[model samples]
Target: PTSSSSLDITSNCIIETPLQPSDFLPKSANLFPKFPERISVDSWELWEFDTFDTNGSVAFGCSLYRDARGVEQGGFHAEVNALWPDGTHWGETLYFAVSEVVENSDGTTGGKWLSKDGGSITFHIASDYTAAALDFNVPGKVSGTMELRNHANVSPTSNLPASDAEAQLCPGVYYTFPMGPVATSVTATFSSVGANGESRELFISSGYGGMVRGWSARPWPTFMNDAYYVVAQVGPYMLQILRTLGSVFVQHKPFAVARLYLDGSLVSAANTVVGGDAVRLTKVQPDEKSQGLSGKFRDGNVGYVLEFAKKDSEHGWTFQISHKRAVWSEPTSAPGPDGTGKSGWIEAISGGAKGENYEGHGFGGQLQIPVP
Candidate 1:
């Protein structure tokens, strides 16, 4: 219908996985020219085109890029993610966490480093539209904040043989326990959507408010993120050592979207969780790295570069949804807002609605969220 130039999100939400900055990225140094925020491992997910209504009829695609294509390991080769909202939760499931450091020492000599200490973390989503040709520099519009707990299952390459530079972040300390799992300590901004013609020209960083100056150097974390550390043998000095670490635990939350379709027909659409209520959906823990299925490049592949369509159909995929619901049931964790290995923050989700993953199965038309 004229590609309907309309976009109203009553509730389009997604609690994305912790993002990871690419190797030597853009002039700003982030990642390839065409890439998403890099949330689930190296997997890339971007909203290309969408249309939906009430019953639930929708279609979306994702792009997957091989990790360090030229490097020795090309794990989790990029792939596309197909999404459809049924009765349960379905889409991308991401987990991210960061270490709290207050830099105790400052100098060229090695005295005190950014050790796992105490800190406060929050996540929130906002609507954005200042499209830079759909690049990776845009932020959001409407937003909220949240505090998270650690989930431990953070670093996927922890046990694997990694270099000193990679070792530190690998099996990172955040991937420790309930707190190990990069929890959104705070929803600096709540998840939001656009109002037909809405956008955020200003890019809000995930580290600290106004910290990631449009992917520039000013708010340079290399020097500010930590108090002091050694870079090369040249002598003790400030270093961009953990510049890439910022992606590990996102201080900024992400925007969410929702759409429904039935038999290729539009129906209803919305933003994240609006009214004061919670939605619960079932969720199963998928294997970190498909030891055989997606990880079977036998010849010598380490990731699910190619989604095993055939095998996936056999095993069947499980999906569910949850709304933005806060879990403040009697002081869930430790105490103190910013303390090392600190705890206190409980688990709060944006609650959701879920649907089962029926292989080759989709909602029969009747859309929910459409690209009006």
Candidate 2:
């Protein structure tokens, strides 16, 4: 196998490249693939529900399909969380690089690129990184720049949601969606150890983009909706938030994805790169003028209230995601960077459709976290 390094800094850092399925090396689904335990099928579809306390008001997303088991032989991929304003959580804390492939004694690509400069790499989830996770010995969230490996176990039986482009082995310039509201901007910052003994930092920002509903296929298309609905609500007119099941709304914020990499390196600027920490949420509100939402099923009545207060209190930011069928109940709190409160929603869905059509009806408004 082949190998590469950026710094000879005599440390225990592990840089994992999404180059081969063997690299990502899957563990039991319970950990990294923290999905629901069981499922129930009805309405000729499937259903299930589970919830966790965010403690911090935030939003979340999920990639609950069969992970790609065959990523190296040659295939496409997806990136992840810390969603954007356009509703995409594609690339937030993602800043790792893929290693150049080198053949080894195995006669296969001896490529195994990781993203840490100090020690070994350990995957994290459920707000609790492993004891060996980045800087666990330090205070604060104990996290550093972590990279994403090309997803293993990606359902070759199902199609990955579209990034609004033709599939390639590499990620496109900027990401976008198929049928979505256009984005205004998106940005990302990344660092890598070069072939030389120096460090490299790269930044990219968006001018505009959108996320398509369903885009790529690891092998084929698989049905993932079991029991969960994507819910939202906004109103002065009282179009109160409702919850549905069977499906959850998954947004590809700032634009839907056009492509993704094995290593969590994202490119959103297309031609010229921009700079920023995270992507914005591509929020869609209740618009009677624009494509207003139409119920895929019966909606809930007025009474429910939305608030955005589930922030990390410490970082002052909160981010959480759920299935498409997940419902929005009454919100807890709506907080902004200034540490103030605003109106938001709390989603809780039981059961509904395997994939009903809410169209624009599923979105909450452009949350204005009450500025301080």
Which predicted model would earn the best lDDT?
2
- Model 1 lDDT tens row, 1-372: 111111111111111343433332211211111222223222222211111112122222112222222122212221112222321111231111221111112211100001122212221111111111111111222222222222223231222212322112222211000011111211122123224332222221211000001111112222122111101100111001111112213332111112222221212221221111111112112343332211111111111110101222342111221111111112212434421120111111111112322211111110011101
Query: What is the lDDT of every predicted structure here?
Result: 0.18, 0.21
Please give the RMSD to the true structure for each candidate, in Å. Answer: 24.4, 20.4
lDDT of 1 at 358: 25
Give candidate 2 regions above 4 Å deviation.
Answer: 5-140, 143-165, 168-255, 258-283, 286-372
Q: List, in order, the clash count of every candidate structure.
A: 124, 106
Give per-residue CA lDDT, model 2, range 138-169, as digits (tens). Answer: 11112233221122233211222233122211
Candidate 2 structure lDDT = 0.21
TM-score, one value per model: 0.18, 0.22
